[PDB]
């Protein structure tokens, strides 16, 4: 998102865009009182904005860096703008390249048959790393199988390609607006 190899004006405009995208996402995810949003969707806002921080990373370096000295039950735009502004400037929580996902799926498929058993993938999801909930695993099985109810294995290559295409489309959607904002006189 943020390009650190631009001019000072370009860097400032990128920062101001980050601020305005933060504002847009926060406002669209504010429920009752303007200027307040629950911390649960803070990673949800980041994903809306393309960042892929891990749950442990989000809890350890995101929330404390934005939460108040007095524990505030919800986060406001104040600490929400500059935090991910700096994150995008430094690309702290940028997800790995698609080759990373390809290698991950190949490692999960030790035999390299081109597909992974649903039971094995759910075991990895719910027992390795950040475990998913039962409904999250159900949704993962549904999508990776193309909503196939009777499917037993998933072709990781097609799923990776579809995920990459959808990520590219969403990145185009989010970045549209990354560009203009200029210093007001």
């Amino acid at each position: 998102m943020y390009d650190p190899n631009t001019s000072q004006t370009e860097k400032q405009k990128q920062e101001e865009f980050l601020k305005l995208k933060i504002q847009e996402a926060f406002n669209l995810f504010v429920k009752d009182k303007k200027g307040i949003v629950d911390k649960r969707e803070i990673p949800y806002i980041m994903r809306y904005l393309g960042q892929f921080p891990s749950e442990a990373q989000v809890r350890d370096a995101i929330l404390p860096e934005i939460e108040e000295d007095e524990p505030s039950e919800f986060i406001k735009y104040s600490k929400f703008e500059p935090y991910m502004l700096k994150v995008l400037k430094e690309r702290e929580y940028e997800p790995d390249d698609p080759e990373a996902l390809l290698a991950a799926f190949k490692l999960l498929d030790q035999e390299g048959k081109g597909y992974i058993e649903i039971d094995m993938m759910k075991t990895f999801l719910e027992k390795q790393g950040i475990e998913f909930r039962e409904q999250e695993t159900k949704s993962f099985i549904e999508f990776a199988t193309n909503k196939d109810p009777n499917a037993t294995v998933i072709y990781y290559e097609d799923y990776i390609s579809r995920l990459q295409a959808f990520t590219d489309k969403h990145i185009e959607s989010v970045m549209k607006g990354y560009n203009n904002f200029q210093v007001k006189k």
Partner: protein, 51 residues
């Protein structure tokens, strides 16, 4: 490669003016729905008192 000063980087104004119109029309539509609720209340009183 001229992509960021007077050719290709004014999408921010695109989506920000879209959202600014979104907010102007949200205020307009909220006032319009206040008027619609007032009209619903007038019709409700009229019809209920007719019943």
């Amino acid at each position: 490669a001229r992509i960021k000063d007077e050719q290709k980087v004014v999408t921010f104004n695109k989506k920000k003016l879209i959202t600014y119109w979104r907010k102007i029309m949200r205020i307009a539509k909220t006032e319009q729905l206040k008027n619609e609720i007032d009209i619903y209340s007038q019709n409700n009183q009229r019809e209920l008192d007719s019943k």
